[PDB]
Ligand binder design. Structure first.
Ligand SMILES: CC(=O)NCc1ccc(S(N)(=O)=O)cc1
Length: 119
């Protein structure tokens, strides 16, 4: 029932994601010189370095907020390269499955700890 445990759990999950080769296209903001029409399609860019820096700055109140930003990385990838046979597409799908598999217990433990606190 530790209300604060999610933060270190998210730091460790982000470390695993950075070690994953599938995270390479998502480690830093999309380069607008390489993809000049990116902002014509994507309203809110997101990447794992921005997620990590938001977490380290103490700017996430809950793991649900972090999860919303990570999910935005994947939805941006799907919206920008929607060829279900593109390299980045396939990397996004595997990394998303890995993230969802590991974030589930982080969210469950946090929601349980908060429900216990407010009992
Ligand atoms: C990160 C993003 O959404 N766009 C950049 C990008 C990177 C790789 C590829 S790809 N499909 O050739 O692997 C297409 C676009």
């Amino acid at each position: 029932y530790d209300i604060q445990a999610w933060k270190k759990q998210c730091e460790e999950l982000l470390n695993l994601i950075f070690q994953c080769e599938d995270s390479e296209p998502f480690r830093q903001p999309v380069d607008l010189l390489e993809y000049p029409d990116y902002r014509d399609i994507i309203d809110t860019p997101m990447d794992f370095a921005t997620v990590r820096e938001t977490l380290e700055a103490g700017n996430y109140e809950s793991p649900m907020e972090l999860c919303k930003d990570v999910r935005l990385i994947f939805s941006n990838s799907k919206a920008y390269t929607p060829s279900k046979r593109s390299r980045i597409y396939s990397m996004s799908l595997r990394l998303s499955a890995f993230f969802e598999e590991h974030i589930s217990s982080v969210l469950s433990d946090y929601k349980s700890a908060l429900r216990f606190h407010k009992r």
